[PDB]
Symmetry: D2
Subunit: 42 residues, 4 copies
């Protein structure tokens, strides 16, 4: 796949397990849009 | 300080440096409210 | 389409136009996952 | 108070009552930081 350079990844400490699940959903949610954003124009 | 048990901390990989700054603001923003939430009733 | 009952919609005032675009992305991002979550099991 | 011009406010429709409470917390959380950000330097 060789891949382009993916956006630099950063780690983040999140207090509260509940908050982590919430942040994960927002994280995965943005990643999902990004996968479709990677769709060619048209 | 001995401290109570703080909420279990979790790490999260965030793609995109811009997204990290954004997630950090939400993270710090929630932590700030939590510091005031730790305020005694009354 | 008759539709099932969609989740009750709520309006929210967001200060700062920049914040609005940011909140909109998170909003649309969650809605996108929801559209795929509406996918039948399997 | 006369006030400066506050950031232009924008309304946003949020599906799911649960999501609304979540978005409200992030909204209030950012507003709280903004109130302290309005603190003079020093």
């Amino acid at each position: 796949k060789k891949k382009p350079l993916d956006g630099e990844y950063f780690t983040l400490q999140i207090r509260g397990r509940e908050r982590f699940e919430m942040f994960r959903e927002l994280n995965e949610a943005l990643e999902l849009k990004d996968a479709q954003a990677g769709k060619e124009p048209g």
